[PDB]
Ligand binder design. Sequence first.
Ligand SMILES: Nc1ncnc2c1ncn2[C@@H]1O[C@H](COP(=O)(O)OP(=O)(O)OP(=O)(O)O)[C@H]2OC3(O[C@H]21)C([N+](=O)[O-])=CC(=[N+]([O-])O)C=C3[N+](=O)[O-]
Ligand SMILES: CCCc1c([C@H]2CCCCN2CCN2CCOCC2)[nH]c2cc(OC(F)(F)F)ccc12
Ligand SMILES: [K+]
Length: 994
Amino acid sequence: MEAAHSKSTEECLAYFGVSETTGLTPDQVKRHLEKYGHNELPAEEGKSLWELVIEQFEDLLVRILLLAACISFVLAWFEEGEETITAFVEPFVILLILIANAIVGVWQERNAENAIEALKEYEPEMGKVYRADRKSVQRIKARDIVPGDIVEVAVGDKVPADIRILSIKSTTLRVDQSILTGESVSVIKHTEPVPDPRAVNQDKKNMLFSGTNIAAGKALGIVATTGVSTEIGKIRDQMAATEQDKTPLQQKLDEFGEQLSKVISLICVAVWLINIGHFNDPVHGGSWIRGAIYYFKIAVALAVAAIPEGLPAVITTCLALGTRRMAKKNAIVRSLPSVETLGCTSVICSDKTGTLTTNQMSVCKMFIIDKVDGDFCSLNEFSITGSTYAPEGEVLKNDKPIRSGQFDGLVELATICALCNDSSLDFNETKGVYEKVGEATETALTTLVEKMNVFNTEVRNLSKVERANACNSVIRQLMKKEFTLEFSRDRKSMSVYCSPAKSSRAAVGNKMFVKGAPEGVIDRCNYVRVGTTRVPMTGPVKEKILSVIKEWGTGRDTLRCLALATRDTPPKREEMVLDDSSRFMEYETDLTFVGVVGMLDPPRKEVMGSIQLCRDAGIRVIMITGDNKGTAIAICRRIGIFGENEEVADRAYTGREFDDLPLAEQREACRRACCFARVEPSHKSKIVEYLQSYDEITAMTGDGVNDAPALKKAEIGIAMGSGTAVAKTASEMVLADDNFSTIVAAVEEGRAIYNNMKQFIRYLISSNVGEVVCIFLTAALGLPEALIPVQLLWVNLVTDGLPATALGFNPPDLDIMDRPPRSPKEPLISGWLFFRYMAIGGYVGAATVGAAAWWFMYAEDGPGVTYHQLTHFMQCTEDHPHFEGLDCEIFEAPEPMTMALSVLVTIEMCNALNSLSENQSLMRMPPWVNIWLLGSICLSMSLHFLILYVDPLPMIFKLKALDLTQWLMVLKISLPVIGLDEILKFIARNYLEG
Ligand SMILES: Nc1ncnc2c1ncn2[C@@H]1O[C@H](COP(=O)(O)OP(=O)(O)OP(=O)(O)O)[C@H]2OC3(O[C@H]21)C([N+](=O)[O-])=CC(=[N+]([O-])O)C=C3[N+](=O)[O-]
Ligand SMILES: CCCc1c([C@H]2CCCCN2CCN2CCOCC2)[nH]c2cc(OC(F)(F)F)ccc12
Ligand SMILES: [K+]
């Protein structure tokens, strides 16, 4: 029964066929249980350890690597590992990384928090029901509660199901619906049906929501829905459908890895098409075991060269360093891959109060009717100092610090503020000054009561402890508060009913004190107030009253206005049904206006400029607030979303206006709208979806467990450092200080991260493209293996992974925020940018080929047989008498291999600086700028020399030391690569445009 808020209390018991006196029979429980299931959100079907391991080994690139150790292992048992006990190491190291990477891939998951599981806190364990089999109440398990059940609740209890209320066995009933919205004010419940069947939850004044707490009182009710059909259950199935996509970089890497696989195979087929010349060999003689191993030893070597094997830890470190870096900037990033998407944001939907504004309201202006004499009108406009909730401040009539008690209309304006108020103050000594006790809007009134000191009470000898509750108190002493007609949104006002103290300071019976939205209250006003006199509400005064209201609420003051009024002859107390909010507006009719108060939720200091940063960075900002559209647009002009004289008729909509549009014109609104006023949580997801339909990367704020669906649906769900736990666990970022400028500061660091990830991603992929060249030459020309895979692994992790994890520390750009947001479908490599690194990749491939083959065909220690094409290594059998002018076994040697591995290191430390800018030269950008990078290049060398000396390592790598002079033909070959890209860089600087 999902419509139970619009049915009469008798209509619901009729629908279920239950007696409020009996409850469900045991047979009725049986049937309703099978029809509706149990009262629980579905137990999530998570993953296990056995599945996680397969996830780590389903990835293409780890699959290609996994195969590359099932071939290196074959070539270890089938290769004489007795002459070289360093043989079984090549297959063993490969597995050791797929194992370590798999281990990293899972402790990234045990800690990962599910946002849906955080909803299951608001599942209480127990609940009280009444059924047929027993006359007393039964505290049964909450999951066993079924719709149609008669259920009891009281203070402290957590509501276990969506409940329609039947009888409120207390003088009042109050509910803490803060988990839903994030608010902090208990709401009064009634029992009359709510007419609108399609009405929102804040208007379901007769419903009890599963998961919310009972603030006051005790009441009985019938259960409308259970499980996933509840209001919070309706939200779980909204996240369970949310397909959060991969970050753009993830799609680039997925597309790169998809292309890197098809590219590796492209070369493997090419090699067999070069040694399709070995297809014309005799059947005898040539050991096919020697030929097949050569191809397989080349294949396990080929795959290692292509895959950036340090990049998974290079990235997941660069991100984690910005994570700690942002935590000092108050940005708490929860999802590591989101530090990249955080910089691609183009739309930022931010709630107004708390983040854009300080949520510290205080009244700035107020006025009374001064004179009504014919069409002539006179207002008594005042102004108030003070921005905190402190009684420090004073009233100023044309800057005369006036004594407020002098004006009689000000004393009535103050009694309304103190009495028609469910908020107060209190001495705060935990932190030194004052703090709001209630609602921000109502507390601003009680503070106004203090600054006025309307009765000139003691002001000199006031201890700043019993302060702030002083002029309020002396007003509560006069009129006794009988009951309150709470604020509802149909009539947009609240009221209190008061009798006097009945002593010598009595009055004309009782009084009603009304406050609310100006238009509604003013319409119900049939009289005014001139000090203590009273006049019929006339046409001019209404126009003059409302004119100032628009000046105050629409002008550059951007004030929230409240029209205060009192009913002088209210109905007799016995004639008011206080169980029907629909009859409250009738009770608040025939009023007399007394004044209007104007308060300001002031914008934050850093907010004013952060909007302009978004303008410079091409980021559209959308405000979302509960202010009326007239004042919403007013605050947007104040912070810079709009220009003070700019038409925005089709660029700012309310909740009612947005739905009256057909789905087509809704999509076009979000493309242009920069402000929404008085929306429903159902619109935060609709706006995200429409902003997504324009391929726009959207940031969205939120606080409640009903902002959670939009937080999930958004590319970057942003939560509050004070929001409910569910909103945080459903977010990719938490503002530790509830501030908007934190978002802009986070978007800045996200670009500084990527703009440097741009380099090392291109720079490691350039070295891999370079190593693959070195293998292909050692394969076509059939040279002795110039780089064994065990050496290539050390390079692609350590001797390269420290320069790569330093380019992240590059100097941030100055125009870093003067450039528009980066596009998602921006391709990995440009046509030029690909060609550039192919030329560099081709060079470094033909230099390790040098050192590990120039150690022949022009060497001192090596053969140096430059005339005779050596090439054939294990091909030589007895073809060496006088054909090979010496021996036949130093083809394989840890002396040429240690020469290529040596030059590659020095070569890749050079490229670690060409990837410091991108187009500008080193004549302009010297290596003096990244000293973090410099002091690390030495370390990889000291490790390179550590594998060229220390006890076991040289044998492990099939490398031996160089000479104090053999570095001659290392730098003679390596260092030229700096000028190579510097040549390619002058192409773009002075002779290329876009
Ligand atoms: N359909 C609507 N009709 C009228 N008002 C709406 C409507 N929808 C929202 N609001 C108003 O907006 C204020 C809350 O919205 P806003 O300040 O933007 O955000 P929130 O406080 O809700 O918390 P959060 O945004 O999650 O951090 C409320 O204070 C008040 O009336 C409410 C309020 N209230 O009970 O909600 C009581 C009140 N008095 O005097 O009793 C004065 C308000 N006011 O002046 O704005
Ligand atoms: C980063 C370069 C590409 C690359 C991928 C791609 C291929 C397309 C599908 C998505 N993955 C990225 C997901 N992986 C899962 C395993 O943990 C690291 C992240 N998977 C690699 C594995 C590597 O193994 C190794 F151990 F060598 F790091 C190396 C590079 C890649
Ligand atoms: K999300």
